[PDB]
Amino acid sequence: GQAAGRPLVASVSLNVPASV
Amino acid sequence: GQAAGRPLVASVSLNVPASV
Amino acid sequence: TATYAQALQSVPETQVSQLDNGLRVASEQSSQPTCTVGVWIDAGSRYESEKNNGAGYFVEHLAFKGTKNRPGNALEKEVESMGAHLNAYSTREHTAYYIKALSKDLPKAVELLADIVQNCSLEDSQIEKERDVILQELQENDTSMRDVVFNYLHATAFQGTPLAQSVEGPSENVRKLSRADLTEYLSRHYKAPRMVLAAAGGLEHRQLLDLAQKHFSGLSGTYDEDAVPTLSPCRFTGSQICHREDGLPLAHVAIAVEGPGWAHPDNVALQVANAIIGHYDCTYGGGAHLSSPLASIAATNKLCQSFQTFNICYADTGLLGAHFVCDHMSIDDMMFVLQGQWMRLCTSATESEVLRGKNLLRNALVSHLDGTTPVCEDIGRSLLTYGRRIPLAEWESRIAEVDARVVREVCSKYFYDQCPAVAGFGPIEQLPDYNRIRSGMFWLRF
Amino acid sequence: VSASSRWLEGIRKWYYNAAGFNKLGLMRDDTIHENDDVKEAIRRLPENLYNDRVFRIKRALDLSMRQQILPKEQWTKYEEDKSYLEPYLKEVIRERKEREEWAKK
Amino acid sequence: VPPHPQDLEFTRLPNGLVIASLENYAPASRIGLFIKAGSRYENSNNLGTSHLLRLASSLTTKGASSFKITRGIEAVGGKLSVTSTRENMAYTVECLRDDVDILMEFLLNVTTAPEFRRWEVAALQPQLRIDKAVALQNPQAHVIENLHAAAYRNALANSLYCPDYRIGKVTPVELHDYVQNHFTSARMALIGLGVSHPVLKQVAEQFLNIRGGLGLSGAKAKYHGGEIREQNGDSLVHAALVAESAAIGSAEANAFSVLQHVLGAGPHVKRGSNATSSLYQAVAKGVHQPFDVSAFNASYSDSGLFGFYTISQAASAGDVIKAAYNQVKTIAQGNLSNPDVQAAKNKLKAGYLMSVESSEGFLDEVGSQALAAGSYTPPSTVLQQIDAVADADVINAAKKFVSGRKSMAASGNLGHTPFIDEL
Amino acid sequence: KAVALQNPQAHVIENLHAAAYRNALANSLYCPDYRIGKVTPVELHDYVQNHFTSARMALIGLGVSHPVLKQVAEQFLNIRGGLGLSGAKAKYHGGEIREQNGDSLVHAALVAESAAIGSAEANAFSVLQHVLGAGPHVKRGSNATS
């Protein structure tokens, strides 16, 4: 399940790896 | 006279700077 | 079936005549349909004091802005009625206007040129507009680093003389130039003994002579009173100028020594010597197999982005040297290699490299004069500098007489143990001290 | 297979076995002394031949460290020794001699 | 007077090769070899092959090594150059009269028998990043390449330079295939200025005939149109709006050239006001800021682009584009004066004549005519054809422009540039 | 940005929005490369000053008492008035963006304008999404009902 279905969200944190 | 008006050409030489 | 010497002998000869007012009319017939006709004038920034510096550039700006008989922007339309190209330029010792057009437009085209260099109206509103435009150009000229470095080299090399003054002049002078100053400049410098009317293309000499007699007989050539601006010898100074701007990515450096002058026999030998050193750019295709040691070393070791050699001539003086653009961590290497090559030429030159340089100069001379504008430029500059156009056969005769001994003697005369002039702009913290540059102009082994 | 040829080849095979580098799995070209011509030739080798040369040399240095040799089955047979490096070195030498010949004129 | 200029000798060999010579008696000689090996003949799996092939002229060949070629060319002071448009490649060699025989040996070795060794080709890869970067210092190159990408779909969309992702990925097999498929006798022309006809004929028969074995044919140009907008926050906004016009060597091409010179194609005077230029005067009436505009034309063997190019500040881009579009519309409706048509015709004639005065321009024109039509047309016939154009055909060309699918490209601070639908 | 842009879906979806819209929703979540190093403190001040206001904010809390949150809001988030910057409505355009990069696989997205959130039509679109097939439910499954 690699195809995108929902719009992007960008995450940033002080002490956690970022994610998309 | 800065606007392009003719199709571009690429020149490469052994002992001259290249130009466009 | 033909040969090099036979081909050189077959070029048609330039024909020169002189009118009564002092004007000189030169032309060279050819079979092409087009032609180029222009007026060269012996008046530049060198004939200007500090009070009126930049007057010539200002007048050159206002040339194509209407006259007494073609007011406003009518003159421009006339040129574009016939699809001709009207161009001009100004330097430290010469000025030129010229038109490229067809043969059929030779009568009309000449009639325009005589209009330009006699009846400059100089409308006051146009003066104000061109003042604003020139101020904008002076502000924008700081972006070109090569031209900045060449102006610095001139200013430091010929300090305290007219040759220090730049063509455009200081920004303060242009703000105060009045119509009185421009009229005085035109009335003093634009005169028939100092003008040359050159042409080249499809035409016949007598037709141009008759048209000149029609449209240029009104020029005065009496040299009113003792108003005869004559040049004087200019002092050369070994010195350094350094503008430190660490924000820029690349460093520009230009180094020079005093040259022989326009009409010296030595110049040909120098033109051979520079051809041995050559030039290089980062986009060249030869790579590491290039004949010049400096170019091959710079290509393999990435010493610089580009370099070139120059020999700029004036009346009884000139600059002879090199200019390179390089990284801020490579200036010592480039200076070392350049001075080593100069000392190599001075002390030990062989036959093969001199033959290569002679062939390069032959090919450059042949290829540069191929058209109508370069031939007309050659006639115009020759008639003011030498007093006559040198045929290509004489150039071949002069070039063929150079050998290793002549190159060694000339280079030892002009380069070895001489005080140079140095100009640097940008991140130039690694540029050597002037004592180190000076000490690099000789060898202890020799 | 004439009189002198088989005698010459017999002496060459004798010397080959006497040299003994085959006992470490090496080939002849692995043992050449690295000068500038050889460094350039090695530089021009394709990926696979380079990697094989690397592993053979590494295994031989490991054996020499342990003062051992391979079993007799794994020795490099004289007839299967491939001169993989010879054509590159030959071209590099030809180019350098051309340069040297141009420097005389 | 000098000897009369001899006629340009022209020949087409049975294998398809074209040989042309002109025996003047200048001190120098210039020999050119023209091939139909432009960037349009690349497919999508070998993009950037032509760019690398242009820079690989100095590499080792079967005839001689790189060292020998470079040193021999520079020893006699000769000059070797390569040029490439979207449709053609041109290898030119210039030297003195008594040095062609040496240099003729080098040129064919560059063309008819390269090697493309692995290490040599690998060492040349980073150069593709340098040269392209230099070519991208001028915004016009970027905008024109994007415009070609937007207008066309398959053939003429290929850039002149390598895609940035594919630098370092071009292998010797691609180069070998490209040369083996595109460098053939039926697609070549050999032009000479300063050498006799039998010498060139002997050289071509000895060497260039064996190269025959004509290969691929190429695609056809598919016009689609579109937009490409690339924002980069520069001081001035560049833009170009074009449409499908015509094919070169056709009746309508002359009409489009005349229309180009009616509208304006840059200044004929140093720091001129462009008083005769209709577009500049139309735009300058409303916009009171510095700007620039010109007509753009580009014809190829099967399709062509006609339109206009503008440079203007970010706030005033829409005003400039709208004004220029309005002016072309008014010309299309019928408002055109015969004196202006004649002035444009004179501009066209003067420009065409003055273009071919030099040896470089003459050789380029002769080679282009030889590849395109396979026959030499003297200047007089071209002048007659230019005069033959009727003033109604210019109106027809303007109508073809105004009622066609536009294609736009732009660059800069695109905060106020319009889209195609807004115009 | 580089860490984010090694998923091809993020590239594609950002280009999809750039192609769909003329303004506001066309903007990317990540900074354009040419702007890296050019964003100034003044721009950050203006953005906070004209977007971080009371009428544009919501304070949500799990595991917290209501009087505490109300006290914090009344004490410290009363100096954020001054609404403004109505922005601009998103004008759907249409278009296509194609990125030749020679990746192993081709990623493609094709869309049209559908409906604003909160409308009844959006529920119909969500149901259409799950009729066509949104994502897999079974590990290494064939997507039988898709």
Kindly provide the resolution of this structure in angstroms, with one decimal: 2.9
Whether residues C151 and C197 fall in one domain: yes
CA R_g for chain A: 11
Answer yes or no: are the C-beta atoms of C54 and C177 closer than 8 Å.
yes
Domain that residue D97 falls in:
1-105
Helices (H) and strands (E) in chain E, counts: 15, 11
Distances in whole angstroms, Cα of residue E150 to Cα of each of B8, E147, E153, F25, F128: 16, 5, 7, 24, 34
Answer yes or no: are the C-beta atoms of C111 and C213 closer than 8 Å.
no
Structure token pair of residue D35: 């000068």
Answer yes or no: are the C-beta atoms of E99 and E48 closer than 8 Å.
no
Instruction: Compute how many other C-beta atoms are within 10 angstroms of the C-beta atom of residue C89.
Output: 13
F69 CA: distance to closest CA in chain A (Å): 23
Residues of chain C positioned with their CB less than 8 A from the CB of B18: 283
D46 contacts E65? CB cut-off 8 A: no
User: What span, in angstroms and rounded, lies between the C-alpha atoms of C181 and C186?
Assistant: 9
**Helix, strand, or coil (residue E163):** coil
Whether residues C212 and C243 fall in one domain: no
Is C48 among the domain residues? Answer: yes
Instruction: Compute how many other C-beta atoms are within 10 angstroms of the C-beta atom of residue C15.
Output: 16
Q: Which amino acid is at E29?
A: S
User: What span, in angstroms and rounded, lies between the C-alpha atoms of E88 and E183?
Assistant: 11
Structure token pair of residue E373: 């039509």
Is E217 among the domain residues? Answer: no
Enclosing H/E stretch for C111: helix C106-116
E200 CA: distance to closest CA in chain C (Å): 14
Is C210 among the domain residues? Answer: yes
Whether residues C306 and C387 fall in one domain: yes
Enclosing H/E stretch for F137: none
Instruction: Compute how many other C-beta atoms are within 10 angstroms of the C-beta atom of residue E345.
Output: 22
User: What span, in angstroms and rounded, lies between the C-alpha atoms of C72 and D58?
Assistant: 87
Percentages (nearest 5) of helix, strand, coil residues in chain D? 70, 0, 30
Residues of chain E positioned with their CB less than 8 A from the CB of F38: 233
Which of E58, E65, E270 to probe the C interface (max C CBs under 10 A)? E270
Pairing type for strands C85-90 and C95-102 reads antiparallel
Residues of chain E with a CB closer than 8 angstroms to some CB in chain D:
65, 67-68, 71, 118-119
CA atoms within 13 A on the CB side of E185: 16
B12 contacts C284? CB cut-off 8 A: no
E293 contacts B3? CB cut-off 8 A: yes
User: What span, in angstroms and rounded, lies between the C-alpha atoms of E293 and B5?
Assistant: 10
F135 contacts A5? CB cut-off 8 A: yes
F129 contacts A20? CB cut-off 8 A: no
Is C304 among the domain residues? Answer: yes
Whether residues C209 and C263 fall in one domain: no
C83 contacts E58? CB cut-off 8 A: no
F101 contacts E44? CB cut-off 8 A: no
User: How deeply is C331 buried, as exposed, middle or buried, from its count of CB atoms within 10 A (0-12, 13-18, 19+)?
Assistant: buried
Whether residues E378 and E284 fall in one domain: yes
User: What span, in angstroms and rounded, lies between the C-alpha atoms of D70 and D58?
Assistant: 14
**Phi (first) and psi of residue E201, to 5 degrees:** -65, -40
Total count of domains within chain C: 2
Enclosing H/E stretch for C435: helix C434-439
Across the interface, of E68, E118, E119, the residue whose CB is closest to D98 is E68
Pairing type for strands C95-102 and C15-18 reads unpaired
Across the interface, of E71, E273, E275, the residue whose CB is closest to C289 is E71
User: What span, in angstroms and rounded, lies between the C-alpha atoms of E337 and E323?
Assistant: 20
Q: Give the residue from chain E lying closest to B8, CA to CA.
A: E85
Residues of chain E positioned with their CB less than 8 A from the CB of F20: none
Which positions ≥6 away from F71 have C-beta within 8 Å? none
List the chains bordering chain B where 3 or more Cβ pairs fall under 8 Å: C, E
**How far from the centroid of its chain's Cα atoms is residue E7's Cα?**
27
**Phi (first) and psi of residue C122, to 5 degrees:** 60, 65
Angle, nearest 10°, between helix axes C331-347 and C266-277?
130
E55 contacts B12? CB cut-off 8 A: yes
User: What span, in angstroms and rounded, lies between the C-alpha atoms of C307 and C95?
Assistant: 28
Q: Can you say whether residue E324 is alpha, beta or left, with left for phi > 0 and alpha for psi between -120 and 50 degrees?
A: alpha
Beta bridge partner(s), residue E34: E90, E189
Answer yes or no: are the C-beta atoms of C411 and C271 closer than 8 Å.
no
**Helix, strand, or coil (residue E137):** coil
User: How deeply is E19 buried, as exposed, middle or buried, from its count of CB atoms within 10 A (0-12, 13-18, 19+)?
Assistant: buried
CA atoms within 13 A on the CB side of E223: 15
Is C222 among the domain residues? Answer: no
Give the alpha-carbon dihedral of C383, C384, C390, C391, to 10 degrees: -40
Pairing type for strands C239-244 and C251-258 reads unpaired
Residue with structure tokens 């290494």?
F140
Structure token pair of residue E422: 């807004």
Whether residues C203 and C254 fall in one domain: no
User: What span, in angstroms and rounded, lies between the C-alpha atoms of F66 and F83?
Assistant: 26
List the chains bordering chain C where 3 or more Cβ pairs fall under 8 Å: B, E
Residues of chain B positioned with their CB less than 8 A from the CB of E82: 11-13
Total count of domains within chain D: 1
Closest C-alpha to C186, from C22, C52, C376, C387: C52
Pairing type for strands E18-22 and E188-193 reads parallel
Answer yes or no: are the C-beta atoms of C50 and C181 closer than 8 Å.
no
Closest C-alpha to F64, from F53, F73, F76: F73
Angle, nearest 10°, between helix axes E338-355 and E391-402?
90
Whether residues C185 and C329 fall in one domain: no
Which positions ≥6 away from C256 have C-beta within 8 Å? C153, C157, C310, C319, C320, C321, C322, C420, C421
Q: Which amino acid is at E70?
A: T
Whether residues C260 and C351 fall in one domain: yes
Residue with structure tokens 């180009």?
E260
Whether residues E173 and E42 fall in one domain: yes
Closest C-alpha to E301, from E371, E369, E247: E247
Which 3-state string (H, E, C) describes C316-329?
CEEEEEEEEEECCC
Answer yes or no: are the C-beta atoms of E409 and E240 closer than 8 Å.
yes
User: What span, in angstroms and rounded, lies between the C-alpha atoms of E307 and E309?
Assistant: 7
Residues of chain F positioned with their CB less than 8 A from the CB of A3: 9, 135
Across the interface, of E67, E71, E119, the residue whose CB is closest to D95 is E67
Whether residues C10 and C89 fall in one domain: yes
Closest C-alpha to E250, from E350, E148, E397: E397
Structure token pair of residue E392: 């109604």
Enclosing H/E stretch for E105: helix E100-112
Closest C-alpha to C37, from C212, C218, C213, C190: C212
Chains E and A touch (3+ CB pairs under 8 A): no
B20 CA: distance to closest CA in chain C (Å): 12
C286 contacts E74? CB cut-off 8 A: yes
User: What span, in angstroms and rounded, lies between the C-alpha atoms of C148 and C250?
Assistant: 14
Which of C13, C60, C111, C429 is catalytic? The answer is C60
Residue with structure tokens 């010898």?
C233
Whether residues C287 and C149 fall in one domain: no
Q: Taking CA E359 as the corner, what is the angle to CA E355 and CA E361, rounded to the nearest 5 degrees?
A: 35
Structure token pair of residue C405: 């001994």
Chains E and B touch (3+ CB pairs under 8 A): yes
Closest C-alpha to E45, from D103, C196, F100: F100
After which residues does chain B break, using C–N > 2.5 Å? Answer: none
User: What span, in angstroms and rounded, lies between the C-alpha atoms of E326 and E307?
Assistant: 13
> Chains D, E: CB contacts under 8 A, how many?
12
CB contact, 8 Å: C381 with chain E? no
DSSP string, C35-47: EEEEEEES-SGGG
Q: Give the residue from chain E lying closest to F32, CA to CA.
A: E232
**Phi (first) and psi of residue C97, to 5 degrees:** -125, 145
Whether residues E102 and E188 fall in one domain: yes
DSSP string, D44-86: TS-HHHHHHHHHHHHHHHHHHHHT----GGGS--GGG---SSH
Closest C-alpha to C274, from C318, C331, C321, C227: C321
Beta bridge partner(s), residue C67: C120
User: What span, in angstroms and rounded, lies between the C-alpha atoms of C5 and C399?
Assistant: 13
**Helix, strand, or coil (residue F15):** helix
The domain boundary, picked from C184, C216, C248, lies at: C216
Instruction: Please indicate whether residue C396 is annotated as part of the active site.
Output: no
Whether residues C194 and C263 fall in one domain: no
Whether residues C304 and C409 fall in one domain: yes
User: What span, in angstroms and rounded, lies between the C-alpha atoms of E74 and B14?
Assistant: 9
Across the interface, of B3, B5, B8, the residue whose CB is closest to E311 is B3
Residue with structure tokens 């970027």?
E142
DSSP H helices in C255-403: 266-277, 293-301, 331-347, 351-368, 373-385, 392-400
**Phi (first) and psi of residue C398, to 5 degrees:** -65, -40
Closest C-alpha to C271, from C311, C300, C312: C311
Is C224 among the domain residues? Answer: no
Q: Which amino acid is at E92?
A: T
**Phi (first) and psi of residue F29, to 5 degrees:** -65, -20
Which positions ≥6 away from E190 have C-beta within 8 Å? E17, E18, E19, E20, E31, E32, E33, E34, E200, E203, E204, E208
Q: Taking CA D87 as the corner, what is the angle to CA D81 and CA D88, rounded to the nearest 5 degrees?
A: 115
Handedness of CA E390, E392, E398, E402 (dihedral sign): negative
Q: Which amino acid is at E278?
A: S
User: What span, in angstroms and rounded, lies between the C-alpha atoms of F95 and F79?
Assistant: 44
User: What span, in angstroms and rounded, lies between the C-alpha atoms of E5 and C340?
Assistant: 50
CATH code of residue C405:
3.30.830.10
Chains F and E touch (3+ CB pairs under 8 A): yes
Domain that residue C125 falls in:
4-216
Whether residues E205 and E305 fall in one domain: no
- Chain D, residues 60-99, CB within 8 A of chain E, namely 95, 98-99
Residues of chain F with a CB closer than 8 angstroms to some CB in chain E:
22, 32, 34-35, 38, 93, 95-96, 100-102
E-only strand ranges, E194-303: 227-231, 236-244, 291-299
Measured between its terminal Cα atoms, the distance across chain B in Å is 15
Is C96 among the domain residues? Answer: yes
Structure token pair of residue D23: 């006992």
User: What span, in angstroms and rounded, lies between the C-alpha atoms of C77 and C70?
Assistant: 10
Distances in whole angstroms, Cα of residue D76 to Cα of each of C197, C252, C284, E394: 88, 61, 49, 83
**Helix, strand, or coil (residue C118):** coil
Domain that residue E145 falls in:
1-212
Across the interface, of C281, C286, C290, the residue whose CB is closest to B17 is C281
Is E234 among the domain residues? Answer: yes
Give the alpha-carbon dihedral of E279, E280, E285, E289, to 10 degrees: 140
E268 contacts C31? CB cut-off 8 A: no
C363 CA: distance to closest CA in chain B (Å): 13
Q: Which amino acid is at E200?
A: L
User: What span, in angstroms and rounded, lies between the C-alpha atoms of C40 and E281?
Assistant: 33
DSSP H helices in E295-358: 317-333, 338-355
Answer yes or no: are the C-beta atoms of C157 and C92 closer than 8 Å.
no
A4 contacts F109? CB cut-off 8 A: yes
CB contact, 8 Å: C286 with chain B? yes
CB contact, 8 Å: C350 with chain E? no
Structure token pair of residue F146: 């898709």
CB contact, 8 Å: B16 with chain C? yes
Distances in whole angstroms, Cα of residue E138 to Cα of each of B3, C55, C303, E133, E236: 11, 33, 26, 10, 12
Structure token pair of residue A19: 């994610």
User: What span, in angstroms and rounded, lies between the C-alpha atoms of E161 and E138?
Assistant: 14
Residue with structure tokens 């071919």?
E356
CA atoms within 13 A on the CB side of C305: 13
**Helix, strand, or coil (residue C247):** coil
The domain boundary, picked from C164, C185, C216, lies at: C216
Distances in whole angstroms, Cα of residue E147 to Cα of each of C98, E85, E407: 37, 15, 7
Answer yes or no: are the C-beta atoms of E84 and E160 closer than 8 Å.
yes
Answer yes or no: are the C-beta atoms of E108 and C257 closer than 8 Å.
no
Closest C-alpha to C340, from C388, C303, C286, C371: C303
Handedness of CA E243, E249, E255, E256 (dihedral sign): positive
Total count of domains within chain E: 2
Pairing type for strands C239-244 and C317-326 reads unpaired
CA R_g for chain E: 23
Is E218 among the domain residues? Answer: no
User: What span, in angstroms and rounded, lies between the C-alpha atoms of C352 and C356?
Assistant: 6
DSSP H helices in C158-215: 171-176, 179-189, 205-215
Give the alpha-carbon dihedral of C404, C410, C416, C419, to 10 degrees: -150
C281 contacts B13? CB cut-off 8 A: no
Whether residues E185 and E231 fall in one domain: no
D102 contacts E119? CB cut-off 8 A: no
